[PDB]
Amino acid sequence: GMTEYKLVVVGARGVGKSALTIQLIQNHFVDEYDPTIEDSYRKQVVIDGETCLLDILDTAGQEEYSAMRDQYMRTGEGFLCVFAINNTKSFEDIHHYREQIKRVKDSEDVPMVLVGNKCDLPSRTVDTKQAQDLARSYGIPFIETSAKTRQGVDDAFYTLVREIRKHKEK
Ligand SMILES: Nc1nc2c(ncn2[C@@H]2O[C@H](COP(=O)(O)OP(=O)(O)O)[C@@H](O)[C@H]2O)c(=O)[nH]1
Ligand SMILES: [Mg+2]
């Protein structure tokens, strides 16, 4: 089979995980998608000439059993850590997602991309500079996105794939 990249989209409720994923996969913006639905989505794409499958888990938070969370973190190869630029608590929550994914995978080298979503909105509580500072500390890319206008969306997911490739080659 073509190479498959198992991607996982994490972040606080309301940041745009579902909207980002549906924009990537289906090329349209959702105003409303139940915050409690967690599902996986698939798309065959070409990234830097490679035809590959993206298998993307749009997470929604607590699971029936914590074992289910740990399972998707172990199977996931790369993580989009999403906050919204108008939600400071969602940015603060990134510290927890960073930790938890490393903790479950028992690894210091986990492919991740920091995503500041909703950049089409002028309303902003997290300046680009502060997010750059956090991404610098993690040694990962930082991309601002809008699921609404599509700005940055392919970049966020394709960059994550490229981070996975860099990890695999070691
Ligand atoms: N303006 C704007 N609204 C967004 C964007 N992404 C998501 N939203 C809205 O933010 C709310 C939460 O989005 P959703 O995808 O359900 O967030 P989730 O809980 O992280 O899955 C919804 O009303 C979306 O329409 C974006 O980039 N721009
Ligand atoms: Mg959602």
d(CA 166, CA 111): 9
> Is-contact 3 48, C-beta < 8 A?
no
Cα of 19 vs centre of ligand 1, distance in Å, is: 5
**The CATH number of 1-170 is which of 3.10.129.10, 3.40.50.300, 3.40.50.880, 1.10.760.10?**
3.40.50.300
The tally of CA atoms less than 13 A away on the side-chain side of residue 71 is 7
Three state DSSP letters for 34-66 = CCCCCEEEEEEEEECCEEEEEEEEECCCCCCCH
Substitution site in 9, 20, 117 for ligand 1 pocket (most atoms within 8 Å of beta carbon): 117
HSE, CB side, 13 Å, CA atoms: give it for residue 19: 23
Q: Work out the burial of residue 43: count CB atoms within 10 Å of its CB; fewer than 13 is exposed, 13-18 middle, 19 or more buried.
A: middle
Residue in 11, 56, 72, 12 with CA at minimum distance from that of residue 161: 56
Q: Which residues contact 145 (CB under 8 A, 6 or more apart)?
A: 16, 20, 115, 116, 117, 119, 151, 152, 153, 155, 156
Tell me the residue type at 14: G
Please spell the DSSP secondary structure of the chain, one letter per residue: ---EEEEEEE-STTSSHHHHHHHHHHS---S---TT--EEEEEEEEETTEEEEEEEEE--S--SSHHHHHHHHHH-SEEEEEEETT-HHHHHHHHHHHHHHHHHHT-S---EEEEEE-TT-S--SS-HHHHHHHHHHHT--EEE--TTT-TTHHHHHHHHHHHHHHHHT-
Q: Which amino acid is at 160?
A: L
Residues 143 and 102: their CA atoms lie apart, in Å, by 21
CB 47 within 8 A of CB 161: yes
Contact present, 8 and 73 (Cβ < 8 Å): yes
User: For ligand 1, is residue 35 a contact (CB within 6 Å)?
Assistant: yes
Cβ(59)–Cβ(98) below 8 Å: no
Q: How far, CA to CA in Å, does 81 sit from each of 46, 48, 168, 169, 170?
A: 23, 23, 20, 23, 23
Distance CA 119, CA 82 (A): 12
- How far apart CA 45 and CA 131 sit, in angstroms, is 29
Q: Nearest 5°: phi and psi at 150?
A: 80, 0
Q: How far is CA 98 from CA 19, 22, 72, in A?
A: 21, 23, 15
What tokens does 26 get?
């289906």
- Cβ contact 116:126 at 8 Å: yes
Dihedral-angle region of residue 147 (phi above 0 means left; psi in -120 to 50 means alpha; beta otherwise): alpha
Q: Residue whose CA is closest, atom 14 of ligand 1?
A: 16
Phi and psi for 138 in degrees, rounded to 5?
Answer: -90, -15
Which ligand has the minimum distance to the alpha carbon of residue 144? 1
